């Protein structure tokens, strides 16, 4: 499984608070930087990871505002952790944005007599307050 921090400014969320940018913090921008422990991967093997930065609408409704892509490496025992840096976005004051991740293994590892299939392991929660960040209002 996956289980993700954002940090805003280097102010991380929780499972019970999301991330909070101080109005005149946001001016510049908000470094969005993003923590995955993953746990039940292949050691030594290689994923693509792709994080979203997604603005959450009080509908529930969700628009993405940045993605990234890295190679990473299961280290061992398939558990560990790994970083995802957005770099600086220039986020709405008063809006609500979410990370979500997902590791794809660039080699087939689950199975017609053969591994034929990429281990898929993801954290796409717009609920989980830890991957969360609000930019305050005045």
């Known amino acids: 499984t996956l289980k993700t921090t954002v940090a805003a400014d280097g102010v991380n969320g929780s499972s019970e608070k999301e991330a909070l940018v101080s109005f005149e913090n ?9 923590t995955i422990d993953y746990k ?6 290689k994923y693509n990871l ?3 930065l997604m603005h959450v609408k009080d509908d529930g409704s969700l628009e993405e505002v940045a993605t990234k892509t890295t190679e990473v490496t299961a280290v061992e025992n398939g558990s560990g952790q790994w970083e995802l840096d957005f770099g600086n976005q220039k986020l ?12 794809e293994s660039v080699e087939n590892l689950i199975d017609n007599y053969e ?3 990429k281990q898929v392991v993801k954290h796409e929660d717009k609920n989980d307050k830890a991957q969360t960040l609000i930019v305050e209002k005045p």
Request: glycine fraction near 10%; aromatic fraction near 6%; charge should be negative.
């Open 115 to 117: 591994l034929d299939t």
């Open 26 to 34: 946001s001016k510049d921008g908000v470094d969005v930087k993003d």
């Open 92 to 103: 709405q004051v008063g809006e609500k944005y979410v990370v979500f991740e997902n590791a």
């Open 40 to 45: 039940d991967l292949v050691a030594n093997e």
């Open 50 to 52: 792709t994080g979203k």
